[PDB]
Design a protein around this motif. Sequence first.
Motif, PDB file in Angstrom:
ATOM      1  N   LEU B  76       0.828  -1.197   0.000  1.00 22.95           N
ATOM      2  CA  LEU B  76       0.000   0.000   0.000  1.00 22.95           C
ATOM      3  C   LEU B  76       0.866   1.253   0.000  1.00 22.95           C
ATOM      4  CD1 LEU B  76      -2.561  -1.127   2.673  1.00 22.95           C
ATOM      5  CD2 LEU B  76      -2.967  -0.911   0.218  1.00 22.95           C
ATOM      6  N   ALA B  77       0.468   2.237  -0.811  1.00 20.76           N
ATOM      7  CA  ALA B  77       1.162   3.522  -0.823  1.00 20.76           C
ATOM      8  C   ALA B  77       1.267   4.111   0.579  1.00 20.76           C
ATOM      9  CB  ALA B  77       0.433   4.501  -1.752  1.00 20.76           C
ATOM     10  N   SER B 119       8.506 -14.579  -4.520  1.00 19.50           N
ATOM     11  CA  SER B 119       7.525 -13.589  -4.095  1.00 19.50           C
ATOM     12  C   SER B 119       8.169 -12.533  -3.215  1.00 19.50           C
ATOM     13  CB  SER B 119       6.359 -14.273  -3.376  1.00 19.50           C
ATOM     14  OG  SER B 119       5.532 -14.955  -4.314  1.00 19.50           O
ATOM     15  N   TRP B 120       9.145 -12.925  -2.386  1.00 18.10           N
ATOM     16  CA  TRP B 120       9.823 -11.933  -1.553  1.00 18.10           C
ATOM     17  C   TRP B 120      10.704 -11.023  -2.392  1.00 18.10           C
ATOM     18  CZ3 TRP B 120       8.284 -10.778   3.169  1.00 18.10           C
ATOM     19  CH2 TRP B 120       7.437 -11.706   3.783  1.00 18.10           C
ATOM     20  N   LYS B 125      11.182  -5.465  -4.556  1.00 17.30           N
ATOM     21  CA  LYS B 125      11.327  -4.532  -5.670  1.00 17.30           C
ATOM     22  C   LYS B 125      10.154  -3.570  -5.738  1.00 17.30           C
ATOM     23  N   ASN B 126       8.945  -4.080  -5.504  1.00 15.31           N
ATOM     24  CA  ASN B 126       7.763  -3.226  -5.475  1.00 15.31           C
ATOM     25  C   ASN B 126       7.759  -2.292  -4.277  1.00 15.31           C
ATOM     26  OD1 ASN B 126       6.777  -4.396  -7.823  1.00 15.31           O
ATOM     27  ND2 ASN B 126       5.604  -5.965  -6.704  1.00 15.31           N
ATOM     28  N   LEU B 127       8.344  -2.702  -3.153  1.00 21.01           N
ATOM     29  CA  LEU B 127       8.429  -1.792  -2.016  1.00 21.01           C
ATOM     30  C   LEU B 127       9.430  -0.674  -2.287  1.00 21.01           C
ATOM     31  CD1 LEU B 127       7.713  -0.900   0.833  1.00 21.01           C
ATOM     32  CD2 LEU B 127       9.249  -2.682   1.715  1.00 21.01           C
ATOM     33  N   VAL B 128      10.561  -1.001  -2.914  1.00 24.39           N
ATOM     34  CA  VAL B 128      11.516   0.035  -3.301  1.00 24.39           C
ATOM     35  C   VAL B 128      10.859   1.023  -4.261  1.00 24.39           C
ATOM     36  CG1 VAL B 128      13.645   0.450  -4.600  1.00 24.39           C
ATOM     37  CG2 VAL B 128      13.565  -1.349  -2.863  1.00 24.39           C
TER      38      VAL B 128
END
Lengths: 137, 137
Positions: B76-77, B119-120, B125-128
């Motif tokens: 989530l943003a 998945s981790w 990468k999506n969190l960065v």
Amino acid sequence: GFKQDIATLRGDLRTYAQDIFLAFLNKYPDEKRNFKNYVGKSDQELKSMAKFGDHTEKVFNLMMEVADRATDCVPLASDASTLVQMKQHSGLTTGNFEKLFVALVEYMRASGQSFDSQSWDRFGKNLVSALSSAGMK
Amino acid sequence: GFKQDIATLRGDLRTYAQDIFLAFLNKYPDEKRNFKNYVGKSDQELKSMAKFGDHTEKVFNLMMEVADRATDCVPLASDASTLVQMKQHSGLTTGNFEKLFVALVEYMRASGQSFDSQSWDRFGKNLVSALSSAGMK
């Protein structure tokens, strides 16, 4: 509410777990019989014994997961079975869990923080019912 | 998969948090400068210190909350904004977080447990990416 309480506890879980489990063992001195290595120790001594810190944190790590997976304070049947079958809990009865949740709710009511005490009381009674349904005395 | 992995880590969160954080600090010794208290100490010395366990557990508790709230490994943003705004993350860049997740995935792949390492990697990468969108350098 109940979901936020899970996050509050998890945010300082080692502290809450030791404080609540000590309140349980001091409210119900007979319950130390089940540990035996805990007899004759003051709270500060227990807090410096490796098997006390590690067991209590694992108790609450799992309890929070069971709470997290519950619907409306009712645990999943599979979580109740897991608790009944653990070799460690052979010789325990629903009364040991009942007393743990009395201590937990009393700790929350005395704490002054915003716990949903009544939801924890319901969760504890529903967990006890599920343990019995899963085969625990 | 990913959701089970969260449950696995949460079940023994203090132990996994210390071991993964040590792997991070030893794989990237320059990152150890962000922690002035940890310089000049062996792994066993750090595990000896109460502040180290408390800190690493609180890091990973929040990471697991962020992971649990993600959709399809996309955080989530709002969770990213929280991590950007925290005082203690002043002066950090996305590269710091990237390196932590490289160490996490490597630890998982080497562990011999059934983690969903892919998945981790995707979550890291999506969190960065989310941290940059939330304002972090």
